[PDB]
């Protein structure tokens with residue numbers, strides 16, 4: 001292992017912890033009961049990550065080809081990092097900077113990266129939630145606004161944009177977003193999104209006014225309501241038409257898709273984005289426990305609950321998607337039968353699904369001319385399931401379209417969107433703690449101020465920066481920033497974290513500390529996965545990222561209402577300047593880890 | 606909006622109180 005001279009005399013040496021435990025109680029906060037701690041760690045690890053990213057990350061990679069590597073990596077890459085994070089956060093009695101600034105101080109920069117990432121996701125997340133808030137307010141009216149098209153000035157024909165496409169797509173792209181035609185077309189600020197953004201940030205600031213001791217009172221509801229609303233929705237979904245016909249599309253993998261580096265890279269990124277690893281949240285939330293709190297139990301419990309929750313959410317979402325696909329296929333076939341019977345004037349109840357081809361053949365062989373001039377639609381089941389859903393366009397395009405087809409639609413809509421909003425707050429609690437704690441650790445503010453002013457300043461700054469996603473071109477910026485803000489850092493930070501813990505602090509000190517804490521040295525599985533397999537898998541993922549990044553064109557989708565073949569969104573290439581923004585969103589939070597270190601290698605020379 | 610700002614003011618004043 002690396003030398004790191006002087007690691008001792010900067011760390012408690014297990015002879016004081018039994019007494020230091022009863023010493024920080026006066027100034028450092030502590031949990032009310034273990035239920036609050038476990039429930040907060042659970043709520044931090046579930047929400048708006050397996051409802052939005054997992055669906056189209058399954059779709060774009062063939063549905064079932066994304067679920068095998070995801071589980072292999074959740075077993076071999078997630079659990080040991082959860083355990084490592086909990087253990088060091090509990091043993092070192094420090095936040096997200098302390099546990100890395102106290103191990104070869106030239107690693108302090110790594111901590112900064114975490115903080116910076118916990119900011120780059122903030123601006124992202126509280127935009128999504130804002131949209132949800134909007135969709136939550138537009139309920140409470142029986143003729144739901146996304147159920148029918150509006151009429152133009154001449155109140156006899158529909159608006160052409162809503163006529164050539166669905167009314168839900170119109171309400172999403174024109175009445176809510178008012179999206180433009182390119183990323184180079186920015187417009188007004190669109191007041192009717194500022195209200196929702198301000199409401200989202202005000203609620204978030206209300207819940208985290210004091211960190212722990214105030215979020216620990218809201219978590220009881222916030223991390224519990226989803227597991228009831230989701231069970232209700234699962235029961236409602238598994239009894240539709242396309243259910244058990246759209247679930248199989250999720251569990252029929254194709255062995256030709258597993259050999260692409262893209263799928264494995266996306267699986268790694270998703271298993272690091274599901275568990276909030278390398279975010280600096282858990283390493284700090286676990287730093288409030290007593291020194292004798294069993295750690296394997298909580299790590300294993302959180303991992304299992306999170307994995308099975310992800311599987312249940314995927315099942316529900318693909319149930320609804322299968323229902324939608326079966327509906328559209330039935331529409332195809334009904335329209336084709338209607339055209340056929342309108343052509344030759346056949347009896348109404350004679351042409352059906354079973355004997356369609358026979359009647360088609362007869363009507364051709366009878367009168368070739370009149371039959372040839374007809375127009376047919378060619379469309380089959382298990383082919384509308386492959387309709388790729390764009391980013392952030394699943395929870396608003398398919399679920400509203402399926403909710404508008406059920407009895408008592410307003411109740412279902414209110415329940416669904418309050419569930420999503422609760423998941424959002426459940427995640428933003430930790431995503432805010434991860435920025436609040438390091439800033440206090442940096443002595444940026446004088447101690448004379450209360451914490452309320454610092455939290456308010458952070459919320460105000462992030463709200464003022466979040467204007468960019470309220471322009472006419474908001475969704476494009478959002479997708480651009482999301483394609484890169486959560487892929488490279490959540491790999492590099494995690495790898496540096498595990499390498500630091502194992503091969504700098506020394507794994508033997510770690511084993512002795514675990515023995516002193518819980519009562520036995522970890523099982524052989526933990527050591528075999530710490531010292532051998534996990535660094536190799538993370539290095540392979542890190543390399544595959546660069547293998548798949550270069551040699552593929554960057555393209556994004558646009559709406560273009562004035563473009564022929566309109567119902568399908570178009571693809572175009574990013575302008576040349578945008579490679580600046582990526583370097584500022586994916587380079588700086590990742591390049592800070594070596595950079596700061598270099599500074600020390602020059603400062604202490 | 607009203608009720609949530611009410612919660613904000615009550616909480617922050619609850620502070621000065623118990624402070």
Ligand SMILES: *[C@@H]1O[C@H](CO)[C@@H](O[C@@H]2O[C@H](CO)[C@@H](O)[C@H](O)[C@H]2NC(C)=O)[C@H](O)[C@H]1NC(C)=O
Pocket residue numbers: 062063252253254255256257386
């Ligand atoms: C698994 O992947 C293969 C290849 O990537 C898929 O085969 C192609 O599927 C597309 C549409 O999904 C068709 O247009 C091609 O004609 C297919 N190619 C061949 C050679 O058959 C396959 O469909 C995928 N399977 C699943 C379940 O997603």
Ligand SMILES: *[C@@H]1O[C@H](CO)[C@@H](O)[C@H](O)[C@H]1NC(C)=O
Pocket residue numbers: 152154157
């Ligand atoms: C509406 O009616 C006016 C005549 O009053 C006509 O000029 C116009 O084209 C109509 N609108 C549409 C969309 O057809």
Ligand SMILES: *[C@@H]1O[C@H](CO)[C@@H](O)[C@H](O)[C@H]1NC(C)=O
Pocket residue numbers: 178187188472
């Ligand atoms: C939508 O955007 C267009 C152009 O950006 C603007 O003219 C229009 O007024 C906007 N919609 C509303 C309701 O203001």
Ligand SMILES: *[C@@H]1O[C@H](CO)[C@@H](O)[C@H](O)[C@H]1NC(C)=O
Pocket residue numbers: 350
């Ligand atoms: C459809 O009409 C033809 C006309 O002779 C008839 O022979 C046939 O039985 C009808 N189809 C069914 C299902 O009865």
Ligand SMILES: *[C@@H]1O[C@H](CO)[C@@H](O)[C@H](O)[C@H]1NC(C)=O
Pocket residue numbers: 361364365368
């Ligand atoms: C219709 O019938 C004619 C008769 O010869 C045949 O040549 C043609 O291929 C048929 N086409 C279709 C679409 O049934």
Ligand SMILES: NC(=O)CC[C@H](N)C(=O)O
Pocket residue numbers: 044045046047048049050121273274275276279427428431
């Ligand atoms: N950075 C975060 O807020 C973590 C989110 C969490 N992994 C989820 O998607 O549920």
